[PDB]
Amino acid sequence: RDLEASIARYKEEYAVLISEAQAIKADLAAVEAKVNRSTALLKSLSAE
Amino acid sequence: VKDQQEAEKKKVMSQEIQEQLHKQQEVIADKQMSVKEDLDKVEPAVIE
Amino acid sequence: VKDQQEAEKKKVMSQEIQEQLHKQQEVIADKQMSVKEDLDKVEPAVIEAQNAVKSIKKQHLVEVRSMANPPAAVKLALESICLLLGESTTDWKQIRSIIMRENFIPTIVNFSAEEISDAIREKMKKNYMSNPSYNYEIVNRASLACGPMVKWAIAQLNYADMLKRVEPLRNELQKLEDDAKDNQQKANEVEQMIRDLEASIARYKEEYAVLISEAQAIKADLAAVEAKVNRSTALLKSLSAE
């Protein structure tokens, strides 16, 4: 049970960490959208 | 994984406890006959 | 968990391999000394066996038709025929046994351990009474035909009565080999099926971290939806008076 508790409780709170990682990927994806959108406008005004 | 395997290693020696449960049956069977022998013998002395 | 445990139960089967590899060390050590014994013994026979093929028809056929065999050849040809299940002491039986064209085949077929100890013990006694004979007259010039076969007849006696020292060694090797070879087949099997489990686990285990994260994504979305429901319900009850 000491292992089982260690097996159990140190399995799902560690799955909370990957949930935080998912937020980072979403934030990185949101930034990546800003990366291309800003670059697209930047090259649009190259003629100007 | 290693926590589970160690737990299952203790589950393997929990099967050893099942063997000791078979030993418990041997202990109980030998004890019951010894108690029966004592019951036929010890009781008159207790009255004395 | 069980697949790895089954893989680790096969790792327990892999834990048998280094015991079997320790048996391999026993096999290798026993093989090396057996090979060393073979190297000290087998090599002259290979030379003699090749010399049998090198023998020319003219050397043998001419001397078979001789009206009297030389005394050097008589002492050595008689013992050779005793190997051929034709034990005899007459020259004509020697002549007949060699006439057949099928006699060029068994110059190599004859093999050492077919010899009975009593038959072998007769030859050392024949060796003692004929020690100056055999290879010594082969070197002289007794006959070109006798050369390859006399030394061939000299051998097969340095194998018997001491291959019996190798018989327990080879029998122990056979017990070690057969136990190891079937177990070594398991070793190849265990390694393959360990990878098969691990490959299955690899495609399965690594996807669960994404899968549980997907569940974490749903509960995060579920909390956001639930928060909106409570917030919007508070708005409606506040806007109820309006």
What gap in Å lies between CA B27 and CA B17, rounded to an integer?
14
For C23-64, give the DSSP string. HHHHHHHHHHHHHHHHHHHHHHHHHHHHHHHH--HHHHHHHH
- Among C3, C4, C208, the strongest candidate for a mutation testing the B interface, having the largest count of B CBs within 10 A, is C4
Asked if residue C168 lies in contact with residue C57, where contact means CB atoms within 8 angstroms, the answer is no
CA dist list (Å): A26 to A17, A31, A33, C209? 14, 9, 11, 17
> Contact A16/C220, CB-based, under 8 Å?
no
For residue C179, what are the contacts with CB-CB under 8 A and spacing of at least 6? C23
Neighbours of chain B (3+ CB pairs under 8 A): A, C
> Contact A19/C209, CB-based, under 8 Å?
no
Say if A21 is an interface residue toward chain C (CB within 8 Å). yes
How many other CB atoms sit within 10 Å of the CB of residue C181?
13
- Tokens read off for C28: 């290798």
Could you tell me how far CA A32 lies from the centroid of its own chain? 11
* Closest C-alpha to C44, from C161, C166, C153: C153
Tell me which amino acid residue A39 is: T
Say if B1 is an interface residue toward chain C (CB within 8 Å). yes
What gap in Å lies between CA C82 and CA C90, rounded to an integer?
12
CA dist list (Å): C194 to C11, C14, C202, C210? 8, 9, 12, 24
For residue C78, what are the contacts with CB-CB under 8 A and spacing of at least 6? C88, C89, C94
Could you tell me how far CA B12 lies from the centroid of its own chain? 19
> Contact C212/A22, CB-based, under 8 Å?
no
Which chain B residue has its CA at the smallest distance from C6's CA? Answer: B5
What gap in Å lies between CA B11 and CA A38, rounded to an integer?
60
First to last CA, chain B: 64
CA dist list (Å): B10 to A5, A37, B6, B30, C175? 15, 58, 6, 29, 36
CA dist list (Å): A30 to A24, A42, C218, C222? 10, 18, 19, 21
Which chain A residue has its CA at the smallest distance from C216's CA? Answer: A19
The experimental technique used to determine this model is cryo-EM
Chain C nearest C-alpha distance from A8 (Å): 13
* Closest C-alpha to C190, from C6, C1, C8, C14: C14
A chain contacts of residue B6, beta-carbon cutoff 8 Å: 3
- Any idea what DSSP says for residue C65? T
